[PDB]
Amino acid sequence: RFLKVKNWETDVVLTDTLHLKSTLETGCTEHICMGSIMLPTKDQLFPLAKEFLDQYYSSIKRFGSKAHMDRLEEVNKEIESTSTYQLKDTELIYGAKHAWRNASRCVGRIQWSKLQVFDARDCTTAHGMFNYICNHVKYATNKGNLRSAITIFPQRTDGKHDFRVWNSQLIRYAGYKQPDGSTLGDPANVQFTEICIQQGWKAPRGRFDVLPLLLQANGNDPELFQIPPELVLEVPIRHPKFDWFKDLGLKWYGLPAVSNMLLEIGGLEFSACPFSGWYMGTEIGVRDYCDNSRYNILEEVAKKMDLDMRKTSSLWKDQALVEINIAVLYSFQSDKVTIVDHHSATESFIKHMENEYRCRGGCPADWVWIVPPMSGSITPVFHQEMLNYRLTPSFEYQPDPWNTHVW
Amino acid sequence: RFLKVKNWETDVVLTDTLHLKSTLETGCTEHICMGSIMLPVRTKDQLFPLAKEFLDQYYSSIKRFGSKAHMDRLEEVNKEIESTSTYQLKDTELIYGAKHAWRNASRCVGRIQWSKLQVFDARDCTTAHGMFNYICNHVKYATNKGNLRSAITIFPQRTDGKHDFRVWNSQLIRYAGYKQPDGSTLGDPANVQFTEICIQQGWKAPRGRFDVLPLLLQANGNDPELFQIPPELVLEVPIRHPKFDWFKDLGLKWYGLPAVSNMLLEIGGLEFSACPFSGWYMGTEIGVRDYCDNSRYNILEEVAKKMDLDMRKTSSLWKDQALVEINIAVLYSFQSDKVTIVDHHSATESFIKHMENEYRCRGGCPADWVWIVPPMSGSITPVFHQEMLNYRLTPSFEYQPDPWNTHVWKG
Ligand code: HEM
Ligand code: HEM
Ligand SMILES: Cc1cc(N)nc(CCc2cccc(CCc3cc(C)nc(N)c3)c2)c1
Ligand SMILES: Cc1cc(N)nc(CCc2cccc(CCc3cc(C)nc(N)c3)c2)c1
Ligand SMILES: C[C@H](O)[C@H](O)[C@H]1CNc2nc(N)[nH]c(=O)c2N1
Ligand SMILES: C[C@H](O)[C@H](O)[C@H]1CNc2nc(N)[nH]c(=O)c2N1
Ligand SMILES: [Zn+2]
């Protein structure tokens, strides 16, 4: 029932009790582990509400008080009557911060409590959504001094009137398939780019074309909007030692802002809730640039370094990989856009584990996602056993809206 | 019930039916994943079904399921169990069992090689001196002057758990570690406790940075005994760098033969507590973990100093830079001395091909992602994007407690 996690580098042992307050399902069984898999009513709503409010009122040290009990009745009277209910601003703020606190795949959670929450529940149109989003981007960007933030659109009702940001991130580059066979721009985004062009977008058909936002309010058909170029902070990528590196003509955006997740608080579902923080360097240098299925530039870089690419054993992919990542970090730092390296981010997470063990009884963590995609074992998270479990409030995946929505 | 795994790089989907033959627990539940947890005498009653499952498997594999030779073998094992409480495997069953224990090792990226394994039957061994002789022969045959060959040596199975054969070393070949009064360590920090035991057993430690440890060997539940492996049998490789001439002056070397000697081999319910096996190294096992773990040789600071890296901010990636040059040095050194080694790109690519073939011919390939993905450059290797299902098949290799923790000393 009590569970131990050990660090094999420092010999330090923590005891987990938070997992008993666990609530959703992992995908695993005692027969088979699924840790490496990417995706595994009035009667339904009240327990969920009760569960959340109980945790809310406990955290402000007001458990079992008159203010607690009255709110429980108030939400109950509202469910039995309206088939749903509304969160107070305080509960909304608390729910969002805890969805992040509980995100077992996020290495940046040391920051969980400094989340700026923007309440967009009064939104009714896609033009309104666009306005809210532009304000979020500008506030979060903050001329390079990035600040975490989330904007929360109206909760799901009958599921026929969902708000959705069709973009998977607020700021992403287009992807175009060509007769050549190869891909121009970002291959992850080819399909969404087809939908933009098919809804009317005039594509510049270049390598780094910032996608338009595709916004759906109240279950209606979505609409296109171009984020003002002056709000999209981008960084050209150069190297501190390699002058030729600029001639690759690489750039990336300063703001990572995930816009396709569903935020679940007290059984209420927020289908549109873009959130943003700041990049860990490997996210761009390792995955975005170096994934076979993404910009896939390794081949091109190692060539410029005049390395022996005859045999895998010269570790030429690995040499190029490190320099690509040196450059990203350097470029951001020199243009003064917040960014964190994987050594620094993992060291912060470990300290954050310790705090959550001592202050909360544990910290849900998904080792497969916490360990950075390069140099894993020279970061302190590699040697750290972690327990993975699902708590609410939470962020969840949801189907791409284009498969679901009807025109 | 069919289960699908996807490769997120190549879009290939595969279908596992093999997990249906799974026995032992994972540690995981519907409510908790234990995926990153490191370490998560039998009755007649329980022994015969285990014998039965195994013999059913063996006889299917040779296409003789339900034959007279199958039925008679079950009858014979049946009788042997009821009358003696245990049973003996035929040579064929032992060979097949040890290959399948390897085939089933879900944390092993080297499994493409599973069917080429030399098996040495040391079930006639009775004494520690007998064990030393078996182990020297294994070391010699496996080393093959650099052209390494996989081998396993199998000592007598457990009886009452009071007469166990054990090799106290965790690997047949490993370097001593010595804790100094000032708190620092000389040699390999991972082996300090074991070095201490050896010294107390009467080993005269030379006290250098790369002292090959002696074998501590327990036969038939007796107190263990010390033996020096003949040095001419210990193939070692001095570490140098193809471009960095100062690299040799770090004084590093490593041994060619990885040979795990602390696992328990389970076949059809029987437990072989001493069963050392060996293969050849993947370069990252020496260059990332052995040299560059903080709790091991920890030469990263020393190497980056000599490269003249900017070591004032982690964000220069000085650590990542040095780690790569060290791993380059390890691969270059083994290849130049003609000692078999595999780099992590080649190993993981091989493993991916193995895995696909296993799904097609066997209906699955249990695989532990936390362990299969290499400890450097994970995502530029094809295992990183590969979903994997982890489950436990027998025959299998299991952890067991260290014998100094359990052993009843006689004197
Ligand atoms: C402040 C700086 C932040 C850093 C450095 C960071 C870091 C990361 C990284 C590296 C990942 C995995 C990346 C990958 O896809 O390879 C991740 C996942 C995730 N993060 Fe963060 N994060 C930050 C802020 C935030 C914020 C503000 C939120 C929400 C409020 C958040 C919620 C999540 C969630 C839900 C996941 C996993 C989603 C999934 O299941 O795939 N993070 N984080
Ligand atoms: C032939 C060359 C081989 C290579 C390159 C290889 C590679 C590896 C590597 C890199 C690991 C992970 C170890 C670590 O990083 O800590 C491993 C684990 C393992 N290998 Fe192999 N292996 C080989 C042969 C063998 C053989 C011959 C056997 C047994 C007959 C074996 C059985 C195992 C087992 C049981 C584990 C998991 C240990 C555990 O559960 O902790 N492998 N292998
Ligand atoms: C806020 C933030 C900070 C940061 N440093 N990186 C990121 C990008 C990583 C990230 C985080 C959460 C969520 C995602 C994508 C979720 C996602 C992923 C896939 C493959 N399919 C879906 N339907 C949904 C990606 C975001
Ligand atoms: C044959 C072989 C080939 C290779 N390339 N690498 C290795 C080393 C990795 C390896 C493999 C199996 C087993 C171990 C040790 C596991 C181990 C760990 C603990 C704590 N207790 C135990 N009883 C056992 C280590 C071995
Ligand atoms: C805590 C964590 O599970 C532990 O450090 C593991 C992770 N993955 C590993 N993977 C390999 N190949 N070898 C190891 O020793 C470890 N250590
Ligand atoms: C198959 C495997 O689950 C998949 O490659 C995962 C592994 N770890 C990851 N880790 C991070 N941080 N991001 C990812 O997209 C993935 N992909
Ligand atoms: Zn699991």
Swiss-Prot record, chain B:
It is found in: Cell membrane, Sarcolemma; Cell projection, Dendritic spine. Ubiquitinated; mediated by STUB1/CHIP in the presence of Hsp70 and Hsp40 (in vitro). Heme b binds at C108, Y399. It comes from the Eukaryota. Isoform N-NOS-1 is expressed in brain and colorectum. Found in the Auerbach's plexus of the enteric nervous system. Isoform PNNOS is expressed in the penis, urethra, prostate, and skeletal muscle, and coexists with the cerebellar nnos in the pelvic plexus, bladder and liver, and is detectable in the cerebellum. (6R)-L-erythro-5,6,7,8-tetrahydrobiopterin binds at S36, V370, W371, F384. L-arginine binds at Q171, W280, Y281, E285. Homodimer. Interacts with DLG4 (via N-terminal tandem pair of PDZ domains); the interaction possibly being prevented by the association between NOS1 and CAPON. Forms a ternary complex with CAPON and RASD1. Forms a ternary complex with CAPON and SYN1. Interacts with ZDHHC23. Interacts with NOSIP; which may impair its synaptic location. Interacts with HTR4. Interacts with SLC6A4. Interacts with VAC14. The PDZ domain participates in protein-protein interaction, and is responsible for targeting nNos to synaptic membranes. Mediates interaction with VAC14. Belongs to the NOS family. Produces nitric oxide (NO) which is a messenger molecule with diverse functions throughout the body. In the brain and peripheral nervous system, NO displays many properties of a neurotransmitter. Inhibitory transmitter for non-adrenergic and non-cholinergic nerves in the colorectum. Probably has nitrosylase activity and mediates cysteine S-nitrosylation of cytoplasmic target proteins such SRR. Inhibitory transmitter for non-adrenergic and non-cholinergic nerves in the colorectum. This is Nitric oxide synthase 1. It comes from Rattus norvegicus. The lineage of its organism: Eukaryota, Metazoa, Chordata, Craniata, Vertebrata.
